[PDB]
């Protein structure tokens, strides 16, 4: 072992930073967030320090490095661009047995600052001794994506319940299993975060009442339009905690690979009624069910209908929104849905009853047709017949955001022509913003 | 932050443990692996301390607590079962400004020892501060089943190459690009774990030979509507690796905590558009990875087109990471789906304040959900115009303030109440008009 990680209590402990530039500013933010009684000594200071000083958050000492400033200090940081000053600081700290970091020379003095994932009171720290800061940030990134934002509130509450769980769960197998469902209970975490103290007390007693077997709940998760990177952090966390994942064709294979093989998978790509009962049945057997749907669950996803089935049965649910096809395709095709005065509104529209064509034909809109390929010849002839100018730009985006994305574009009088040239899943975008693609297309 | 994690170099530094039982032994073992010069002061010692002392790996002092034994120490650990003694140790260490752990009292004294996942020289440390040692242990096992055991050898080889990387690559960006390739090369990791130095050298030689692009980049990243969990995985990657992050006030606080700690951050809240464009242009022309972090989605009422056309006109590369737009986030978190069955044919995302003006006949049409962005100040005009162009007076409306955050507020009513409803909230807020608003009483799962 090269270094021993320790977690220091710095509240109201004198710490010293030498330096007043951006390096020192980054270190000082860290120590302020830890509650240090912070002094900063530098020949000059950047404006952020005077701001902190005027708010009484720290003390500034302008001038050359003064070793007597280390007199009552617990930690020192050398954060200048001058190697002779940093060596003076680390030498004075060493002789006082004060742990010291030289920012630009991690093996020069006595401690290294790791990458930190803060879920206080829960904290994770990653370092490799300065041999590989890029690896440390790469690992920090994975951990940040995995650890729910409000886990620390759950950790705090867990400690207050340590006594109750022991008196109810005899063996450590049992309370280990209790703690495992406790730390993944979404209703509890959001109830703690929202300061809804009655939902806390309801969730708390429901967690003690039900069998350890039962963790029944459904999460509707929007998987985004295809690219696995367009899943949300919460969405990834939910599919990592699922007992059962119910998905269909419009969920990309790259998304499905982020589900651990330890979860049951149920493929329902079958009228809507059957899907509703599947979710019902598996939530009532007490499993964590994630219903994965393409894009956003509440935008032509029939997501509402599945949740109404669950409401009439008393099964907790939540929804994780996702990137709808329009947003994904817009960003990845270089076609902004709005721009300057081009469009006062964006219309997301499907392809008994039928569409209001005069309304769709009006100016200053971006039109986005979902499930519109089969009707694309109709859409061309009717938009023209209802006054939309023949030179209106149109684009069709197929498999948007994925490695198979194809974009075709022209004007409206060639819209029906370009539509047989693509296949589902495809969006039809009509409007002046379509012209912007020649400049903004950064993708395939 | 409850604690500040630091990684201490203990080689040849005096450390004191008080106590000689099984707790002290566990801590002594750790401090010996770290290379500490270790004294153990205790009334009695379990046999393992005899084994260590015979080998000359530490100094035993048999007797009650000797405060003067702290005088040259960098760390102290109180590991007795006597809380009077433990607190004398903590007090003596405090006066000397020596960080001190009381093992049976995490909240007392001045450092805590975390759980350690060892892939030396790579190390991960986890602690919940004694609030939930069960959580720390569950997390410690997940981290174990996540970090490959190859990883220590990749990190060790990186350490050996750092001098050559600094010599051969002039700029900081080049060195970063090298390391970013180095750490994801699976063949190199396999060859290191196999001690196949022929393969190690050939892959390494090729890595050093690749042209490294020096161009700065600008990434437009949608931060989503507030909740940090609604950032995309790709958006998180970009802000974890940017040099500079240019962020609005419509980017929540929790999102900014996800920026890498050593990134520079430039505020552009309330500055006009051509201020922002130029700030991006220049830091990008400095060869730095720039992330432009905007609320919601960058291409929905975000003015992301204008910033990018300036960079295209100047030869600067760029990309766009979409985000959850306010309509989708507030929809999910208020229990108001934007489409549903027969209710809504179409969703309209509309801006509220503009220059000619809005096409109210168009907006008043039945079977749609209207979502007004930036429309608070015109709520009275919206109600009057939609009524005048034939929308039913009892049409449900909702206003979502600070959607998806812990401060989210929802008010709802009918169209004839829209103007007064808007006075009960402030920016940032959405106006939702449509029959789907009535679904809230069955689909609301978040709060109120
Ligand atoms: N990756 C993709 N590229 C282009 N269009 C897509 C797409 N994924 C879904 N779509 C569109 O969405 C339609 C299915 S309806 C479901 C839409 C989803 N809830 C969402 O928010 O996007 C398809 O007919 C297609 O037009
Ligand atoms: N968290 C939130 N809750 C409610 N409305 C929000 C919001 N965040 C942004 N908005 C809306 O967005 C308007 C700014 S326009 C910026 C919109 C952003 N690009 C997006 O895609 O959502 C605000 O006036 C408000 O109407
Ligand atoms: Cl160094
Ligand atoms: Cl490192
Ligand atoms: Cl022993």
CSV table of C-alpha atoms in Angstrom, one decimal, chain B residues 12-422:
chain,number,residue,atom,x,y,z
B,12,UNK,CA,8.9,6.7,7.7
B,13,UNK,CA,6.3,8.8,9.7
B,14,UNK,CA,5.6,8.0,13.4
B,15,UNK,CA,2.1,6.9,14.2
B,16,UNK,CA,0.7,5.9,17.6
B,17,UNK,CA,-1.9,3.3,18.4
B,18,UNK,CA,-3.3,3.1,22.0
B,19,UNK,CA,-4.7,-0.3,22.9
B,20,UNK,CA,-3.6,-3.8,22.1
B,21,UNK,CA,-6.7,-5.9,21.3
B,22,UNK,CA,-8.2,-7.1,18.1
B,23,UNK,CA,-9.4,-3.7,17.0
B,24,UNK,CA,-5.8,-2.3,17.5
B,25,UNK,CA,-4.4,-5.2,15.6
B,26,UNK,CA,-6.7,-4.6,12.6
B,27,UNK,CA,-5.6,-0.9,12.5
B,28,UNK,CA,-1.9,-1.8,13.1
B,29,UNK,CA,-2.0,-4.1,10.1
B,30,UNK,CA,-3.2,-1.3,7.9
B,31,UNK,CA,-0.6,1.2,9.1
B,32,UNK,CA,2.2,-1.3,8.6
B,33,UNK,CA,1.1,-2.0,5.0
B,34,UNK,CA,1.3,1.8,4.6
B,35,UNK,CA,4.9,1.8,5.9
B,36,UNK,CA,4.3,3.8,9.0
B,37,UNK,CA,6.8,3.8,11.8
B,38,UNK,CA,4.4,2.5,14.4
B,39,UNK,CA,4.4,2.5,18.2
B,40,UNK,CA,1.6,0.6,20.1
B,41,UNK,CA,1.0,1.6,23.7
B,42,UNK,CA,-1.2,-0.7,25.7
B,43,UNK,CA,-1.7,-2.5,29.0
B,44,UNK,CA,-1.9,-5.9,27.3
B,45,UNK,CA,-1.3,-7.2,23.8
B,46,UNK,CA,-2.8,-10.1,21.9
B,47,UNK,CA,-0.3,-12.5,20.5
B,48,UNK,CA,-0.1,-11.0,17.0
B,49,UNK,CA,1.7,-7.9,18.4
B,50,UNK,CA,4.4,-10.2,19.8
B,51,UNK,CA,4.9,-11.7,16.3
B,52,UNK,CA,5.2,-8.2,14.8
B,53,UNK,CA,7.5,-6.9,17.5
B,54,UNK,CA,9.8,-9.9,17.2
B,55,UNK,CA,10.2,-9.1,13.5
B,56,UNK,CA,11.0,-5.5,14.4
B,57,UNK,CA,8.0,-4.1,12.5
B,58,UNK,CA,6.8,-1.9,15.3
B,59,UNK,CA,7.5,-0.7,18.9
B,60,UNK,CA,5.4,-2.0,21.8
B,61,UNK,CA,5.1,0.2,24.9
B,62,UNK,CA,3.5,-1.8,27.7
B,63,UNK,CA,1.8,0.3,30.2
B,64,UNK,CA,-0.9,3.0,30.6
B,65,UNK,CA,-1.3,5.8,28.1
B,66,UNK,CA,1.9,8.0,27.7
B,67,UNK,CA,0.9,11.3,26.2
B,68,UNK,CA,4.5,12.2,25.4
B,69,UNK,CA,4.4,9.3,22.9
B,70,UNK,CA,2.4,11.6,20.6
B,71,UNK,CA,5.1,14.3,20.4
B,72,UNK,CA,6.5,13.3,17.0
B,73,UNK,CA,3.4,11.6,15.6
B,74,UNK,CA,1.4,12.4,12.4
B,75,UNK,CA,-1.6,10.2,13.2
B,76,UNK,CA,-3.0,8.7,16.4
B,77,UNK,CA,-5.5,5.9,16.9
B,78,UNK,CA,-7.4,5.2,20.2
B,79,UNK,CA,-8.3,1.6,20.1
B,80,UNK,CA,-8.9,0.7,23.8
B,81,UNK,CA,-12.2,-0.5,25.2
B,82,UNK,CA,-11.9,2.2,27.9
B,83,UNK,CA,-13.7,5.4,26.8
B,84,UNK,CA,-12.0,7.5,29.5
B,85,UNK,CA,-8.6,6.4,28.0
B,86,UNK,CA,-9.7,6.9,24.4
B,87,UNK,CA,-10.8,10.5,25.2
B,88,UNK,CA,-7.5,11.3,27.0
B,89,UNK,CA,-5.8,10.1,23.7
B,90,UNK,CA,-8.1,12.2,21.6
B,91,UNK,CA,-7.5,15.3,23.8
B,92,UNK,CA,-3.7,14.9,23.8
B,93,UNK,CA,-3.8,14.5,20.0
B,94,UNK,CA,-6.1,17.5,19.5
B,95,UNK,CA,-3.8,19.9,21.4
B,96,UNK,CA,-0.9,18.8,19.2
B,97,UNK,CA,-3.0,19.1,16.0
B,98,UNK,CA,-2.6,15.4,15.3
B,99,UNK,CA,-5.4,13.7,13.4
B,100,UNK,CA,-6.8,11.0,15.6
B,101,UNK,CA,-9.3,8.2,15.1
B,102,UNK,CA,-11.4,6.9,18.0
B,103,UNK,CA,-12.4,3.5,16.6
B,104,UNK,CA,-15.5,3.0,18.7
B,105,UNK,CA,-16.6,6.6,18.3
B,106,UNK,CA,-16.6,7.8,14.7
B,107,UNK,CA,-18.2,11.2,15.5
B,108,UNK,CA,-15.6,12.0,18.1
B,109,UNK,CA,-12.1,13.0,17.1
B,110,UNK,CA,-10.8,14.0,13.7
B,111,UNK,CA,-10.5,11.3,11.1
B,112,UNK,CA,-12.3,8.1,10.2
B,113,UNK,CA,-10.8,5.1,8.5
B,114,UNK,CA,-12.7,4.1,5.3
B,115,UNK,CA,-13.2,0.7,3.8
B,116,UNK,CA,-10.6,0.1,1.1
B,117,UNK,CA,-10.8,-1.6,-2.3
B,118,UNK,CA,-7.1,-2.2,-3.2
B,119,UNK,CA,-5.9,-2.4,-6.8
B,120,UNK,CA,-2.6,-0.9,-5.9
B,121,UNK,CA,-1.5,1.6,-6.9
B,122,UNK,CA,-5.2,2.2,-7.6
B,123,UNK,CA,-7.3,2.5,-4.4
B,124,UNK,CA,-11.0,3.2,-3.8
B,125,UNK,CA,-12.1,4.2,-0.3
B,126,UNK,CA,-15.7,4.2,1.0
B,127,UNK,CA,-17.2,5.4,4.2
B,128,UNK,CA,-20.6,6.5,5.5
B,129,UNK,CA,-18.9,8.1,8.5
B,130,UNK,CA,-20.3,5.5,10.9
B,131,UNK,CA,-23.9,6.6,10.0
B,132,UNK,CA,-24.4,3.4,8.0
B,133,UNK,CA,-21.5,0.8,8.1
B,134,UNK,CA,-23.9,-1.6,6.4
B,135,UNK,CA,-24.2,0.8,3.4
B,136,UNK,CA,-20.4,1.1,3.2
B,137,UNK,CA,-20.0,-2.7,3.2
B,138,UNK,CA,-22.7,-3.2,0.5
B,139,UNK,CA,-21.1,-0.5,-1.6
B,140,UNK,CA,-17.6,-1.9,-0.9
B,141,UNK,CA,-18.7,-5.2,-2.4
B,142,UNK,CA,-20.3,-3.7,-5.5
B,143,UNK,CA,-17.1,-1.7,-6.1
B,144,UNK,CA,-15.1,-4.9,-5.8
B,145,UNK,CA,-17.3,-6.6,-8.5
B,146,UNK,CA,-16.8,-3.6,-10.8
B,147,UNK,CA,-13.1,-2.7,-10.8
B,148,UNK,CA,-11.1,-5.4,-12.7
B,149,UNK,CA,-8.0,-6.9,-11.1
B,150,UNK,CA,-6.1,-6.0,-14.3
B,151,UNK,CA,-6.5,-2.4,-13.2
B,152,UNK,CA,-3.5,-2.2,-10.8
B,153,UNK,CA,-1.1,-3.2,-13.6
B,154,UNK,CA,-2.6,-0.7,-16.0
B,155,UNK,CA,-2.1,2.1,-13.4
B,156,UNK,CA,1.4,0.9,-12.5
B,157,UNK,CA,2.5,0.9,-16.2
B,158,UNK,CA,1.0,4.4,-16.6
B,159,UNK,CA,3.1,5.6,-13.7
B,160,UNK,CA,6.2,4.2,-15.4
B,161,UNK,CA,5.3,6.0,-18.7
B,162,UNK,CA,4.5,9.4,-17.2
B,163,UNK,CA,8.0,10.8,-17.7
B,164,UNK,CA,8.0,9.8,-21.3
B,165,UNK,CA,4.5,11.3,-21.9
B,166,UNK,CA,5.6,14.6,-20.4
B,167,UNK,CA,8.7,14.6,-22.5
B,168,UNK,CA,7.2,13.7,-25.9
B,169,UNK,CA,3.9,15.7,-25.8
B,170,UNK,CA,4.1,19.5,-25.5
B,171,UNK,CA,0.6,20.5,-24.6
B,172,UNK,CA,-1.7,19.4,-21.8
B,173,UNK,CA,-4.4,18.4,-24.3
B,174,UNK,CA,-2.1,16.0,-26.1
B,175,UNK,CA,-1.1,14.2,-22.8
B,176,UNK,CA,-4.8,13.9,-21.9
B,177,UNK,CA,-5.6,12.4,-25.3
B,178,UNK,CA,-2.8,9.9,-25.0
B,179,UNK,CA,-4.1,8.8,-21.5
B,180,UNK,CA,-7.7,8.6,-22.6
B,181,UNK,CA,-6.6,6.1,-25.3
B,182,UNK,CA,-4.2,4.3,-23.0
B,183,UNK,CA,-6.8,3.6,-20.3
B,184,UNK,CA,-9.4,2.0,-22.6
B,185,UNK,CA,-7.1,-0.2,-24.6
B,186,UNK,CA,-8.2,-3.7,-23.7
B,187,UNK,CA,-5.4,-5.5,-25.5
B,188,UNK,CA,-2.8,-3.5,-23.5
B,189,UNK,CA,-4.5,-4.4,-20.2
B,190,UNK,CA,-4.5,-8.1,-21.2
B,191,UNK,CA,-0.9,-8.0,-22.3
B,192,UNK,CA,0.2,-6.4,-19.1
B,193,UNK,CA,-1.6,-9.1,-17.0
B,194,UNK,CA,0.1,-11.7,-19.2
B,195,UNK,CA,3.6,-10.3,-18.7
B,196,UNK,CA,3.8,-10.3,-22.6
B,197,UNK,CA,6.2,-7.4,-22.9
B,198,UNK,CA,6.6,-7.9,-26.7
B,199,UNK,CA,2.9,-7.1,-27.1
B,200,UNK,CA,3.1,-4.3,-24.5
B,201,UNK,CA,5.9,-2.6,-26.4
B,202,UNK,CA,4.3,-2.9,-29.8
B,203,UNK,CA,1.0,-1.5,-28.7
B,204,UNK,CA,2.8,1.2,-26.7
B,205,UNK,CA,5.0,2.2,-29.6
B,206,UNK,CA,2.0,2.5,-31.8
B,207,UNK,CA,0.1,4.7,-29.2
B,208,UNK,CA,3.0,7.2,-29.0
B,209,UNK,CA,3.1,7.4,-32.8
B,210,UNK,CA,-0.5,8.4,-33.4
B,211,UNK,CA,-1.2,12.0,-34.5
B,212,UNK,CA,-2.9,13.8,-31.7
B,213,UNK,CA,-5.5,16.5,-32.6
B,214,UNK,CA,-5.0,19.7,-30.8
B,215,UNK,CA,-8.3,21.4,-31.7
B,216,UNK,CA,-10.5,22.7,-28.9
B,217,UNK,CA,-14.1,21.7,-29.0
B,218,UNK,CA,-17.5,23.0,-27.9
B,219,UNK,CA,-20.1,20.5,-26.8
B,220,UNK,CA,-23.7,21.8,-26.3
B,221,UNK,CA,-25.1,19.7,-23.4
B,222,UNK,CA,-28.7,19.7,-22.3
B,223,UNK,CA,-28.6,19.7,-18.5
B,224,UNK,CA,-32.3,18.6,-18.3
B,225,UNK,CA,-34.9,20.5,-16.3
B,226,UNK,CA,-33.4,20.3,-12.8
B,227,UNK,CA,-33.1,16.9,-11.2
B,228,UNK,CA,-29.5,15.9,-11.6
B,229,UNK,CA,-30.6,12.3,-12.2
B,230,UNK,CA,-32.1,13.5,-15.5
B,231,UNK,CA,-28.7,14.3,-17.0
B,232,UNK,CA,-27.8,11.9,-19.8
B,233,UNK,CA,-24.9,9.5,-19.4
B,234,UNK,CA,-23.3,11.2,-22.4
B,235,UNK,CA,-23.9,14.6,-20.9
B,236,UNK,CA,-22.3,13.4,-17.7
B,237,UNK,CA,-19.3,12.2,-19.6
B,238,UNK,CA,-18.8,15.6,-21.3
B,239,UNK,CA,-18.9,17.6,-18.1
B,240,UNK,CA,-16.7,15.2,-16.2
B,241,UNK,CA,-14.0,15.7,-18.9
B,242,UNK,CA,-14.4,19.4,-19.9
B,243,UNK,CA,-11.7,22.1,-19.4
B,244,UNK,CA,-14.3,24.8,-19.1
B,245,UNK,CA,-18.0,24.7,-18.4
B,246,UNK,CA,-20.1,27.7,-19.5
B,247,UNK,CA,-23.4,27.4,-17.6
B,248,UNK,CA,-26.7,29.3,-17.2
B,249,UNK,CA,-28.8,30.0,-14.1
B,250,UNK,CA,-31.3,27.5,-15.6
B,251,UNK,CA,-28.7,24.7,-14.8
B,252,UNK,CA,-29.5,23.4,-11.4
B,253,UNK,CA,-27.1,23.3,-8.4
B,254,UNK,CA,-26.8,19.6,-8.3
B,255,UNK,CA,-25.8,19.4,-11.9
B,256,UNK,CA,-22.9,21.8,-11.3
B,257,UNK,CA,-21.6,19.4,-8.5
B,258,UNK,CA,-21.1,16.8,-11.3
B,259,UNK,CA,-18.6,19.0,-13.1
B,260,UNK,CA,-15.0,17.7,-12.6
B,261,UNK,CA,-13.5,19.6,-9.7
B,262,UNK,CA,-10.6,21.0,-11.6
B,263,UNK,CA,-12.7,22.5,-14.4
B,264,UNK,CA,-13.0,26.2,-14.8
B,265,UNK,CA,-16.6,27.4,-14.7
B,266,UNK,CA,-18.0,30.6,-16.3
B,267,UNK,CA,-21.4,31.9,-15.3
B,268,UNK,CA,-23.6,33.4,-18.0
B,269,UNK,CA,-26.7,34.3,-16.1
B,270,UNK,CA,-28.3,37.6,-15.2
B,271,UNK,CA,-25.3,38.8,-20.1
B,272,UNK,CA,-26.6,38.8,-23.7
B,273,UNK,CA,-26.0,36.2,-26.5
B,274,UNK,CA,-23.0,37.8,-28.3
B,275,UNK,CA,-21.2,37.8,-24.9
B,276,UNK,CA,-21.7,34.0,-24.7
B,277,UNK,CA,-20.7,33.3,-28.3
B,278,UNK,CA,-17.4,35.1,-27.9
B,279,UNK,CA,-16.5,33.5,-24.6
B,280,UNK,CA,-17.1,30.1,-26.2
B,281,UNK,CA,-15.1,31.1,-29.3
B,282,UNK,CA,-11.9,32.1,-27.5
B,283,UNK,CA,-11.6,29.3,-24.9
B,284,UNK,CA,-12.3,27.0,-27.8
B,285,UNK,CA,-9.6,28.7,-29.9
B,286,UNK,CA,-7.3,28.1,-26.9
B,287,UNK,CA,-7.4,24.4,-27.7
B,288,UNK,CA,-9.6,23.5,-24.7
B,289,UNK,CA,-12.6,21.2,-24.4
B,290,UNK,CA,-15.5,23.5,-23.8
B,291,UNK,CA,-19.0,22.4,-22.7
B,292,UNK,CA,-21.8,24.8,-23.1
B,293,UNK,CA,-24.3,23.6,-20.4
B,294,UNK,CA,-27.9,24.8,-20.9
B,295,UNK,CA,-31.1,24.1,-19.1
B,296,UNK,CA,-33.4,21.5,-20.6
B,297,UNK,CA,-32.7,20.7,-24.2
B,298,UNK,CA,-30.2,22.9,-26.2
B,299,UNK,CA,-32.4,23.0,-29.4
B,300,UNK,CA,-35.8,23.8,-27.8
B,301,UNK,CA,-36.1,27.5,-27.1
B,302,UNK,CA,-32.4,27.4,-26.1
B,303,UNK,CA,-30.8,29.5,-28.8
B,304,UNK,CA,-28.3,26.7,-29.4
B,305,UNK,CA,-28.4,27.2,-33.1
B,306,UNK,CA,-26.8,30.7,-33.0
B,307,UNK,CA,-23.8,29.7,-30.8
B,308,UNK,CA,-23.0,26.8,-33.1
B,309,UNK,CA,-23.3,28.8,-36.4
B,310,UNK,CA,-20.6,31.1,-35.1
B,311,UNK,CA,-18.2,28.1,-34.4
B,312,UNK,CA,-19.0,26.5,-37.8
B,313,UNK,CA,-18.1,29.9,-39.4
B,314,UNK,CA,-14.8,29.8,-37.5
B,315,UNK,CA,-13.7,26.2,-38.2
B,316,UNK,CA,-14.3,25.0,-34.6
B,317,UNK,CA,-15.7,21.5,-34.2
B,318,UNK,CA,-18.7,20.8,-32.1
B,319,UNK,CA,-21.4,18.4,-31.1
B,320,UNK,CA,-24.7,18.4,-29.3
B,321,UNK,CA,-25.9,16.2,-26.5
B,322,UNK,CA,-29.7,16.5,-26.2
B,323,UNK,CA,-31.4,16.9,-22.8
B,324,UNK,CA,-34.8,16.3,-21.2
B,325,UNK,CA,-36.8,19.4,-22.2
B,326,UNK,CA,-38.9,21.1,-19.5
B,327,UNK,CA,-42.1,19.7,-21.1
B,328,UNK,CA,-41.0,16.1,-20.7
B,329,UNK,CA,-39.6,16.5,-17.2
B,330,UNK,CA,-42.5,18.5,-15.8
B,331,UNK,CA,-44.9,16.1,-17.6
B,332,UNK,CA,-43.4,13.0,-15.9
B,333,UNK,CA,-43.1,14.7,-12.5
B,334,UNK,CA,-46.5,16.3,-12.3
B,335,UNK,CA,-48.4,13.2,-13.5
B,336,UNK,CA,-49.5,15.0,-16.7
B,337,UNK,CA,-48.7,12.9,-19.8
B,338,UNK,CA,-48.4,15.1,-22.8
B,339,UNK,CA,-50.3,12.7,-25.0
B,340,UNK,CA,-52.9,10.1,-24.0
B,341,UNK,CA,-55.3,7.9,-25.9
B,342,UNK,CA,-57.9,10.2,-27.5
B,343,UNK,CA,-57.1,13.3,-25.3
B,344,UNK,CA,-54.2,14.7,-27.4
B,345,UNK,CA,-53.5,14.3,-31.1
B,346,UNK,CA,-50.5,16.7,-30.9
B,347,UNK,CA,-48.2,18.5,-28.4
B,348,UNK,CA,-47.4,22.1,-29.1
B,349,UNK,CA,-44.3,23.6,-27.4
B,350,UNK,CA,-44.9,27.3,-27.7
B,351,UNK,CA,-42.9,30.4,-26.6
B,352,UNK,CA,-44.9,32.9,-24.6
B,353,UNK,CA,-43.1,36.3,-25.2
B,354,UNK,CA,-41.7,37.3,-28.6
B,355,UNK,CA,-41.2,40.4,-30.8
B,356,UNK,CA,-45.6,39.2,-35.3
B,357,UNK,CA,-47.6,37.5,-32.6
B,358,UNK,CA,-49.1,34.1,-31.9
B,359,UNK,CA,-51.5,32.3,-34.3
B,360,UNK,CA,-54.3,31.9,-31.7
B,361,UNK,CA,-56.8,30.2,-34.0
B,362,UNK,CA,-54.2,27.6,-34.5
B,363,UNK,CA,-53.4,27.2,-30.8
B,364,UNK,CA,-57.0,27.0,-29.7
B,365,UNK,CA,-57.7,23.9,-31.8
B,366,UNK,CA,-59.1,20.9,-29.9
B,367,UNK,CA,-57.3,17.6,-29.1
B,368,UNK,CA,-53.9,19.1,-28.3
B,369,UNK,CA,-51.7,19.7,-25.4
B,370,UNK,CA,-50.3,23.2,-25.3
B,371,UNK,CA,-47.0,23.8,-23.4
B,372,UNK,CA,-46.0,27.4,-23.1
B,373,UNK,CA,-42.4,28.2,-22.3
B,374,UNK,CA,-41.5,31.6,-20.8
B,375,UNK,CA,-45.2,32.5,-20.6
B,376,UNK,CA,-45.8,33.7,-17.1
B,377,UNK,CA,-45.9,37.4,-17.9
B,378,UNK,CA,-48.4,36.8,-20.7
B,379,UNK,CA,-50.7,34.4,-18.8
B,380,UNK,CA,-53.6,36.9,-18.8
B,381,UNK,CA,-53.2,37.4,-22.6
B,382,UNK,CA,-53.0,33.7,-23.2
B,383,UNK,CA,-56.2,33.0,-21.2
B,384,UNK,CA,-58.1,35.8,-23.1
B,385,UNK,CA,-56.9,34.9,-26.6
B,386,UNK,CA,-57.5,31.1,-26.2
B,387,UNK,CA,-61.0,31.8,-24.8
B,388,UNK,CA,-61.7,34.3,-27.7
B,389,UNK,CA,-60.6,31.8,-30.3
B,390,UNK,CA,-63.0,29.2,-29.0
B,391,UNK,CA,-61.2,27.1,-26.4
B,392,UNK,CA,-63.7,25.8,-23.8
B,393,UNK,CA,-63.7,27.8,-20.6
B,394,UNK,CA,-63.5,24.7,-18.4
B,395,UNK,CA,-60.3,23.5,-20.2
B,396,UNK,CA,-58.0,22.3,-17.5
B,397,UNK,CA,-54.6,24.1,-17.1
B,398,UNK,CA,-51.6,23.5,-14.8
B,399,UNK,CA,-48.5,25.5,-14.1
B,400,UNK,CA,-45.4,23.6,-13.1
B,401,UNK,CA,-42.8,25.7,-11.2
B,402,UNK,CA,-39.3,24.3,-10.8
B,403,UNK,CA,-40.3,21.0,-12.4
B,404,UNK,CA,-38.4,17.9,-11.3
B,405,UNK,CA,-36.7,19.6,-8.4
B,406,UNK,CA,-37.2,19.2,-4.7
B,407,UNK,CA,-38.9,22.7,-4.9
B,408,UNK,CA,-41.4,21.7,-7.6
B,409,UNK,CA,-44.7,23.4,-7.2
B,410,UNK,CA,-47.9,22.6,-9.2
B,411,UNK,CA,-51.0,24.7,-9.3
B,412,UNK,CA,-53.9,23.7,-11.5
B,413,UNK,CA,-57.4,24.8,-12.5
B,414,UNK,CA,-59.4,25.7,-15.6
B,415,UNK,CA,-58.7,28.1,-18.4
B,416,UNK,CA,-60.8,30.9,-16.9
B,417,UNK,CA,-58.3,30.8,-13.9
B,418,UNK,CA,-55.1,30.9,-15.9
B,419,UNK,CA,-54.3,34.5,-15.2
B,420,UNK,CA,-54.7,34.3,-11.5
B,421,UNK,CA,-53.1,30.9,-11.3
B,422,UNK,CA,-49.9,32.4,-12.8
